[PDB]
Scaffold this active site. Sequence first.
Site, short mmCIF file in Angstrom:
data_model
loop_
_atom_site.label_atom_id
_atom_site.label_comp_id
_atom_site.label_asym_id
_atom_site.label_seq_id
_atom_site.Cartn_x
_atom_site.Cartn_y
_atom_site.Cartn_z
N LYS A 88 0.81 -1.21 0.00
CA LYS A 88 0.00 0.00 0.00
C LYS A 88 0.82 1.23 0.00
CE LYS A 88 -4.06 -1.83 0.28
NZ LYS A 88 -3.76 -3.13 0.88
N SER B 6 -2.65 -13.10 3.66
CA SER B 6 -2.95 -12.95 2.24
C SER B 6 -1.84 -13.51 1.36
CB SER B 6 -3.17 -11.48 1.91
OG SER B 6 -3.41 -11.30 0.53
#
EC number: 2.5.1.47
Lengths: 313, 314, 101
Positions: free
Chosen positions: B41, B272
Site C-alpha cells: 500500500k 494474504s
Amino acid sequence: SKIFEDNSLTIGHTPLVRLNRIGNGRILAKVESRNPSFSVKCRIGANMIWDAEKRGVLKPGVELVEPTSGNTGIALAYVAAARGYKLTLTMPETMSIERRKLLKALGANLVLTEGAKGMKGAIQKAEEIVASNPEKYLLLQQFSNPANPEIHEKTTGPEIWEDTDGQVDVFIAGVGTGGTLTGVSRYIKGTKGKTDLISVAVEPTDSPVIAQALAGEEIKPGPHKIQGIGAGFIPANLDLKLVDKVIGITNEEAISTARRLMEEEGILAGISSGAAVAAALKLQEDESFTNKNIVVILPSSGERYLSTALFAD
Amino acid sequence: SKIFEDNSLTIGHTPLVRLNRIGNGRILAKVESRNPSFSVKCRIGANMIWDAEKRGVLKPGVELVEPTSGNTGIALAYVAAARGYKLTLTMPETMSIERRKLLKALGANLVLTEGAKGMKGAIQKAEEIVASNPEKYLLLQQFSNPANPEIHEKTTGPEIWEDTDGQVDVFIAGVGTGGTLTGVSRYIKGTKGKTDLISVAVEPTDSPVIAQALAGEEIKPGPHKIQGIGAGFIPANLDLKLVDKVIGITNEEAISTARRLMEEEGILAGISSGAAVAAALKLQEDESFTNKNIVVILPSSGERYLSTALFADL
Amino acid sequence: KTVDKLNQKQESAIKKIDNTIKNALKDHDIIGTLKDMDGKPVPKENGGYWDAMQEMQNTLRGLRNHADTLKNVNNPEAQAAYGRATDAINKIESALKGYGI
RNA sequence: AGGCUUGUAGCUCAGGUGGUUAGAGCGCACCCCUGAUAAGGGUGAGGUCGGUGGUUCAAGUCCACUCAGGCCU
Ligand SMILES: [Mg+2]
Ligand SMILES: [Mg+2]
C-alpha cells in the site's frame, strides 16, 4: 532480468534519504530496515553463512548455534530457512513471547536459559551444545567473525560511495558489534582512498566503553535503553584506529529523536536510529560541520519494538 | 548518484524471489514487504497524494481524511509525514492499542467511531468530517481512485516484466481493492501486448464476491480471517474484464501456507501471502500449469500479524 | 609485613558492600534490569512502571566506589570484602554484556 | 600558682609514624526501593580542624603563647 534464487541473496541496496526537517538538510540517512528481516543484521546473517559455505565448514548435516537476544537471531533464522539449514538459538528467559513466536515460526529451536545468569548463561549453553558434538554443530561468533565487517566492506561502503558520489565527509554509526563502522571506514579510507573521512561512533552515556578504551581508562559498562548498541566491551570487529570521534547519547534524547524521525520524516526508527541521528545533530551544533555531508545509519524499524517504551500512551 | 529527497520516493524495486521448497520451482514471489512502510500500500499511499498534488486539489493548508486503519492508513501516515500534510484516520474503537500507537507515532489524528457499526460508521464519520468544511478536508477514496492502478501500471508491471524478461504466464494477486491486479494486467496485456497472461484473483470462500459477480449471482459476502483481501463487494477499481480465474482459499489454507512459507523459504509472510501461494499450489494441480512461470504478489509480513491467529504455535 | 587496622571509611565501605549485595543483588533485580533494557518494564500496583535500571546503575556505582576505596589495604577482611564486591560487579556485567545484539 | 587532660560536619565522636584537601554514625534536601513502616542504596548542601606565630618540601598531627571546659589543688 534478475530473479533471486533465495531470500538470502536479496540483501542491500538500501535507500539513502535526505532528512529535511531534522537538522539543516545535510544529514543523509541510510535506511537499513529495508532488508528481508528488517535490520542491519541481515547483511551479516547472510555473509557468515556464505563464508561458512565457502570455507567448507558448513556442510549438509552441520547445524548452527548462536547466543543472541537481538536481531542477529532473526537474521540467522531467515538465512537458515532460506538456504535449508538448521538453527538453535540460545537466549535468556527474560525476552518476550512475540520474539519467541517470530523466531519459532521462522524455523528456529529456542533454548531458553536462566534469566538471572542472562547473557553469559546463553553463551555457556551454546558452548556446551557445540562441545557435545563439535563435528555436528557450528558456532558463528558474531563479535569475532571477519564476515561481519567484510560484508560492510563489500556492500554498504560502495553503496554510500555511489549514492553520495564520493562526497561523504562524516560517517556516523552506532557500535554494537563494530562491523558496520569498520567495514564502511575501511572501504572509504583504505580501498578508495579518502583519509579525510571522520568516522564517528555512537555510544550510550550509561556504558561509554569506547571512550574509556580510547582514553586509557578501565572498561566499565552499565545498563541502558538504547538497544542494538552498547555491548559493554570492545569487540574484535571494532578497530579503534579507524574511529576518529565518539559521541555519547542519553536514553531520553535517543527516544525523542526516534519519535521526531517517525513523526516528521515518515521513517520507522528504533532507539539506536534516534541515537545516531541525535549524535549527528549534536555534531552539527559545531560550526565546522555546517556544510559537511553527513551519512548516518538507521539499523532497525520501530515496528519491531512496538510493545516497548518507545510508544508511550 | 541517488540521494532520495523523502521516504515516499523510495517505493518500488522490490525483489522477485524463486520458491524452491513450495511447488516445482516455478513460483516467483514479488515480496512487497520491502517498501518503506512494509506493505503493498506504500505505492498507492504515495501515488494518491502525488496525484492530488498534481491535480491541484491538495493545496498547502489542506488536511487528509481516509476511513481506514489497515495498511493503507499506515501508508498515508508515512507519506503525509514525509511530505508535510495532516492526516485524520477514522476507525472503529475495537481496533488494537498497538496499531493505534503505530498510527499516532507517525503523526496521524485518530477519530474513533463506535464498535456497533464498524467500518460503515468509520466511512460515515469521514464523510461528515469532509462535509463539515470541504475546502480543508479531502477524501482519498482508495476503492475508486485511478492512482491506485496507475501506480501498479507505472511501477509494478515494469518490474515484473523486466525481471522475468517477458516470460510471465500466470499472475496471482489477491483482490482487496483490485488495484495491483488491474495495474499489472493492464501493463502486460495492454502495453506489452501479451494476451496469453492468465490473471487470477484470490478471494475467501466465506466471501466469494468475485465468483458471484462473474457467475451472474447476487452478492452475499461473509466474515473471514484473511485480512487484506475480501472487502465484501466489487470495488470500482477492479475491472472484471481482466480477471480470467477466481480461486477461493479457506482460512486454514492461508494460515498454513503462510507458516509454511516462513519456515521453508525464510520469507516473512502474512495471511494474504499464504492465500496467494495456496492459490498457486491449487492451480499447479492441473497438468497444463506444470511448466508455466507463476508470478505471485506477497503484500505483507508477519510483523503486523503478530497478535493474530497466524502465530499460534507456542 | 605490617598489617593495618581499618579506618571508619573502610569499615563503612565493607558494611555498604554487604548490605548492597544482600538487598540489591537479588535475582529479581537482574530480571528487572534485563526487562528494562529490552523495553517492557514491570508495572506498579496502582498504575505506572517500576525502574530497575536506575537502581542497578546506583548499585554498580556504589560497588565500584567501595571497591576502589579498598584496593591497597592490607587487612585480610578488607580484601575479602573487596573480593565480594568484585564478584558482584562481575555478576552484573556478565549478566549485561552482549545483551540485545 | 603548678602539674595534667579536652575543642574536628547540626549533635556524639575516630584521625597509624607529617601525605588526597577531610571521615564514620545519627540529623537535612532530591531519586529508586518496602502497598506502607522498619530494614537498604545513590547524588549533594554542610568543615577560619579553638585563636595567633614558628619549623618543614609539605602541619588537624610537631613546638611557643593565649581563649573556653574537666582532676589534685
Ligand atoms: Mg530487589
Ligand atoms: Mg562538637
